[PDB]
Design a protein around this ligand. Sequence first.
Ligand SMILES: [Cl-]
Ligand SMILES: [Cl-]
Ligand SMILES: [Zn+2]
Ligand SMILES: [Zn+2]
Lengths: 184, 184
Amino acid sequence: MTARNILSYSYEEYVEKITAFHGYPAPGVLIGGFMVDLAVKNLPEGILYDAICETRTCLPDAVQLLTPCTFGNGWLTVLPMGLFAVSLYDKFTGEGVRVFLDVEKMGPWQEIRNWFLKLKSERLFKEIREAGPDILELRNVKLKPGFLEKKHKGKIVLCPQCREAYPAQDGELCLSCQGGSPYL
Amino acid sequence: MTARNILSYSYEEYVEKITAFHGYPAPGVLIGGFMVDLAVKNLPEGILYDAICETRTCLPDAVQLLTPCTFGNGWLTVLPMGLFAVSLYDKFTGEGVRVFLDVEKMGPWQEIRNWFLKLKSERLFKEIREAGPDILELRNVKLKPGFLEKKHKGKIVLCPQCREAYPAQDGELCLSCQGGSPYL
Ligand SMILES: [Cl-]
Ligand SMILES: [Cl-]
Ligand SMILES: [Zn+2]
Ligand SMILES: [Zn+2]
C-alpha cells in the first residue's frame, strides 16, 4: 500500500509498463526501477547521460523503459559481469553514479534476500515495493577512457564468402564467416 | 504515400513508436521494422520465438519494439558482428529465418545504398518507405547447439574485494574486480 513512484510513473503504472515490455513483472526489473530512479535523482539537473548495466538479466529493461538510453541507440552498454548494478553517467565527462543492492540493508526483507542470493512470491513482490530504495547503495564513479572513445568512421566492404556488407576492420571475412556464425 | 504496415502498426504509427523509444527515426530501425515484419510472417503461426541481431546498431530496437524479445528477458541475443541481419527462431527447435539486406535489390534506391555502404536525408526516408521489404532477402536457418543450452543454476557468492554478490563460477573475485570494471 506504500506510495512509490518511479520517475514520472506510479509503482502500478511502472509495473504495467514493465510487464508489457519485459513479459512478466520480474523482481529484477521492479528493483531496477528503484535503482534507475535513485540514479537519475543523483545526476545534475537536465544533463545528457549514458547508462551501463553490469548484468544482462532484467536490469537492462528498467533502463530501456525509463531512460532514453537503449541497447539499439548505443547509449546503453551492457557489461555482462553478473553484478546487479547500473551506472548513469555524463556523456561528455564520464562522471556519474553507480547504484547497486546493499545486502547489509536486507534484514527486514528475507524474501528479497532469498531471491537475490538464490537461496532454496506474493510475499517477494510486496517486499520489493515496501523496501523501495532502502535496499540500495549509491557511489560516485568516473568511467575509464575507453568508454568515452570516438567511435570509428569504418569503411564498408563485401564479405567474399557470404556476400554481405561488413566493416573492413573486422578482417578478410566478416566475423560471422570467421566463426561467429550462430547458424549450422 | 505507399501503405506499409509493420506487424499491427501503420508505417506512421511505427515511426512514432520508434522515435519515442530510440530517440530518432533512424533508417536502421525503420528498415529493421520491415525485416522483423518479414521474419515474423515466415515463422509458423502462433509459435514462441527467440531473436538474434548480428549488429548492435539500431536493429535491436526494432526487435524490442515489435516482438516480446528484449535484451533484458534474454529472448533477444545480440552478436556484435557488424552484419545488418536478424533471425527469429523457434525456442524449442532452433529452426528459424534470417533476414538481411540484399544490395543486389538496391538499384532503384541509391540513397538507401549510400546509407548502407556509408558512401560520401528527406530522400533517404522516402526511399526506405517506398522500398519496404523489396531490399530484403530471407533464408531458413537452424541455430548451433550452444544457443539452445540449458542456462546454469549458478551459486551466488560474495566478492571479497567489492563485497557484492556474483556467480561463483566467475572466479575468486567478480569479473569487475578481475578487471572488467569500467570505472576509474
Ligand atoms: Cl551478466
Ligand atoms: Cl555490431
Ligand atoms: Zn561473411
Ligand atoms: Zn568484486
